[PDB]
UniProtKB/TrEMBL annotation, chains A, B:
Top-level taxon: Bacteria
Molecular functions per Gene Ontology: DNA binding; DNA-binding transcription factor activity
Disulfide bonds: 26-92
Protein name as it appears in the record: Transcriptional regulator, ArsR family
Signal peptide from the UniProt entry: none
Domain HTH arsR-type: 2-93
Organism of provenance: Rhodobacter capsulatus (strain ATCC BAA-309 / NBRC 16581 / SB1003)
Cysteine persulfide carried by residues: 26, 92
Keywords assigned by UniProt, alphabetized: DNA-binding, Transcription, Transcription regulation
Key word Transcription present: yes
Residue ranges the record marks as coiled coil: none
Length: 93, 93
């Protein structure tokens, strides 16, 4: 129904409407980032970032892959990634 | 700071992450709507819609103007309107 769509969308927004997680998502809008890249650009507790990434992964918003001993996170869900790009662009001008 | 921006953005998302208000915002993405247009397309209590509009107005997300005895609401905040367009597009395909 017209409404289940609005519920899905508002649930996505709910998942994005968190300062730390949103910042991660914006860093990822500019391309895949390593856990170190993230932690350094966020300047927030190692455990905080780990849990924020874990949550975003759980919610299907980001994915990760390995190379050597560096893990690279990237945006995953198509709808979320587009929304996050718009949010990133609009809150930077 | 890099962070006050993420706080502003997450506050916008917070304001949008509500089924009824989000639906109003999506109806407005396609252009200004009268209170009757809204109430009919939402199929929800007269008072509910009134309060949702009032809230969105309070938060600077919509504006209204009069013509005769019809009030027309339209999207107001530029950042929110762009975000809502992206949300509308992405949750309709």
């Amino acid at each position: 129904e017209m409404a289940t769509r609005a519920r899905a969308a508002s649930n996505l927004l709910k998942a994005l409407a968190h300062e730390g997680r949103l910042m991660i998502m914006c860093y990822l809008a500019s391309g895949e980032k390593s856990v170190t890249e993230l932690e350094t650009r966020l300047s927030t507790r190692q455990a905080a970032v780990s849990q924020q990434l874990a949550r975003l992964r759980l919610e299907g918003l980001v994915q990760s892959r390995r190379e050597g001993k560096t893990i690279y996170y990237s945006l995953s869900d198509p709808r979320a990634a587009r929304v996050v790009q718009t949010v990133y662009e609009q809150f930077c001008s």
